[PDB]
Amino acid sequence: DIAHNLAQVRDKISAAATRCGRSPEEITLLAVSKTAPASAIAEAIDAGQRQFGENYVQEGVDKIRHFQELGVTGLEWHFIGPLQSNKSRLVAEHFDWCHTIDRLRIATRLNDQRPAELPPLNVLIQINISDENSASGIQLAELDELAAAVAELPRLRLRGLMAIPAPESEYVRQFEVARQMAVAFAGLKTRYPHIDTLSLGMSDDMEAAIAAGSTMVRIGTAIFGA
Ligand SMILES: *Cc1c(COP(=O)(O)O)cnc(C)c1O
């Protein structure tokens, strides 16, 4: 049951934050609903969840339109999958956040495709921190350059960083990789305005990411099931 899973996940988040001396309010739960049907999202919505993460543009847009047709207010939709140039218009027209900025041309497209009547699209820059098998995300060495370029796009708002670390079994490495992101995040916060979002941690590494300094865990299966 989705309402039960939501409350439980939220308890683990709340425990994990206070144990490491953090207010639980600091951590946002992003309910990842890729491969969940709109009916499962509706259950989470009714239980109070407002923030949802989608990986595949067209399915995400279908879910967004479904709930617009119902009139549901206060939802916040995060695109967290890799963004292809031929589908960037759909993200710019329908989503509130995009976590996967890893090249300037895609961010310029998003900027130029964002309808004028909408507020700026909130974006995160994606770091490939530890995954030699992913083509998504930049190296940390490229961050200062890309962040400066993206920060000038007036139809976007740079909010921080996202990473999908390579999967790790040892809690030690989970923490250590998450800390590299946390360190990059704090360094970025010392010069850029409104840097407040570090999208870091999934179901299996949630405690390490929070201890490392994540502000936003992306939880799918522990909420919606397989
Ligand atoms: C699917 C996915 C998640 C959620 O994964 P779970 O293991 O089900 O918690 C989080 N972030 C991204 C980028 C994903 O693609």
Numbering used by the authors: 3 to 228
Provide the authors' original text about this structure.
The pyridoxal 5′‐phosphate (PLP) homeostasis protein (PLPHP) is a ubiquitous member of the COG0325 family with apparently no catalytic activity. Although the actual cellular role of this protein is unknown, it has been observed that mutations of the PLPHP encoding gene affect the activity of PLP‐dependent enzymes, B6 vitamers and amino acid levels. Here we report a detailed characterization of the Escherichia coli ortholog of PLPHP (YggS) with respect to its PLP binding and transfer properties, stability, and structure. YggS binds PLP very tightly and is able to slowly transfer it to a model PLP‐dependent enzyme, serine hydroxymethyltransferase.
We serendipitously discovered that the K36A variant of YggS, affecting the lysine residue that binds PLP at the active site, is able to bind PLP covalently. This observation led us to recognize that a number of lysine residues, located at the entrance of the active site, can replace Lys36 in its PLP binding role.
